[PDB]
A paper describes a structure:
Virtual screening, ThT assays, and biophysical characterization successfully identified two widely used FDA-approved drugs, canagliflozin and doxazosin, as inhibitors of [name] amyloid formation. Cryo-EM was performed on fibrils assembled from 30 μM [name] in the same buffer used for kinetic assays (160 mM ammonium acetate, pH 7.4, 1% v/v DMSO), in the absence (4 replicates) or presence (2 replicates each) of 50 μM YX-I-1, canagliflozin, or doxazosin. Fibrils with a similar morphology were observed for the control (no small molecule) and doxazosin-containing samples, with the majority having a twisted ribbon morphology and crossover distances of 60–100 nm. The majority of fibrils formed in the control (69%) and doxazosin-treated (72%) samples were classified into three related fibril structures (named LL, LLU, and [name], respectively), which have a shared structural core consisting of a pair of protofilaments related by a 21-screw symmetry. Each protofilament is formed from a single stack of L-shaped [name] subunits, with straight β-strand segments encompassing 13ANFLVHSSNNF23 and 25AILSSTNVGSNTY37-NH2, hinging on a turn at Gly24. In addition, further flanking subunits presenting U-shaped [name] subunit conformations and ambiguous β-strands were observed adhering to these two β-sheets, with the combinations of these flanking subunits differing to generate the three individual polymorphs LL, LLU, and [name]. Thus, out of the fibril structures that were identified in each data set, YX-I-1 fibrils consisted of 89% C-fold subunits, whereas this subunit fold was absent from fibrils grown in the control or with doxazosin. By contrast, the control and doxazosin-treated samples consisted of L-fold (62% or 72%, respectively), U-fold (34% or 28%), and S-fold (4% or 0%) subunits.
Author numbering:
A (entry chain R), B (entry chain N), C (entry chain J), D (entry chain F), E (entry chain B), F (entry chain V), ...: 15 to 37
G (entry chain H), H (entry chain D), I (entry chain L), J (entry chain P), K (entry chain T), P (entry chain X), ...: 16 to 29
The structure:
């Protein structure tokens, strides 16, 4: 058998910025 | 058998910004 | 047998902004 | 047998903005 | 047998804005 | 049997910025 | 005393 | 005393 | 006393 | 007394 | 007294 | 005086997909 | 004086999809 | 004086889909 | 005086995908 | 008294 | 006087993917 | 006087992927 | 012969 | 012969 | 013969 | 013969 | 014969 | 004969 187990107990803050390109 | 288990117990804050491109 | 199990117990705040492009 | 189980017990706030493009 | 089970016990606030484009 | 186990108990802060290119 | 067998749903006892 | 067998739905006991 | 067998769902007892 | 056998889900007892 | 056998999920007892 | 001038003479194809999140 | 001038001479195809979330 | 001028000379095709959420 | 001038003469193809997160 | 056998998940007892 | 001039004469293909996170 | 001049005459292909994180 | 003075709009002559 | 002065609109001559 | 003075818009002559 | 003075816009002559 | 003075925009003559 | 004075933009003659 195959078992994928993910357990998260903490706060996560993710910020992603893509852009600001001048052509 | 195959078991995918996802467990999240914490606050998650995600911000994504795409754009601001001048052509 | 195959088992997909998703369990979320925490607050989630997601903000997505796409745009602001000048041509 | 195949079992998809989704369980959400927390508040979710999602904001999506698309637009603000000048041509 | 195949079982899709969705269970939501929390408040959900979704805001979507599309538009504000000048041509 | 094969077992993938991921356990996170700490706060995670990730910031990603891609862009700011002038052509 | 709560006994649950083959629980695929969400069970909430208070 | 709550006994549930083959529960695929949502059970809420208060 | 909480006894759970073959629990694939989410069980919340308070 | 909490006894869990073959628990693949999330169990929360408070 | 908490006894867990074959626990693949997340168990939280408080 | 202040002059904002935007001139677009080419075809623009924009595709945006937001979603497909399981909780 | 202040002058905002927008001029578009090309075809524009925009597709936006928001949704497909399971709770 | 203030002058907002918008001029569009090209075909525009916009498709927006919001929904398909299961709770 | 201040002059912002944007001139685009080429085809632009932008694809943005945000999502596919399992909690 | 906490007894855990074949624990592949995360167990948190407080 | 201040002059911002942007001139683009070439095809631009931008692809952005954000997501695919398991918690 | 101050003059910012950007001139692009070539094809640009940009691909950005952010994500695929397991917690 | 096309003469345009202070053109803020779009002028198309064919 | 097309002469336009202070054109803020769209002028189309064919 | 095309003469343009103070052109802030887009002029297209074909 | 194309003469342009103070051109801040886009001029296209074909 | 193309004469351009104080050209801040894009001029395309073909 | 192409004469350009104070060209800050892009000029393309073909």
């Amino acid at each position: 058998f195959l078992v994928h187990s993910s357990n998260n107990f903490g706060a996560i803050l993710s910020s992603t910025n893509v852009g600001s390109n001048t052509y």
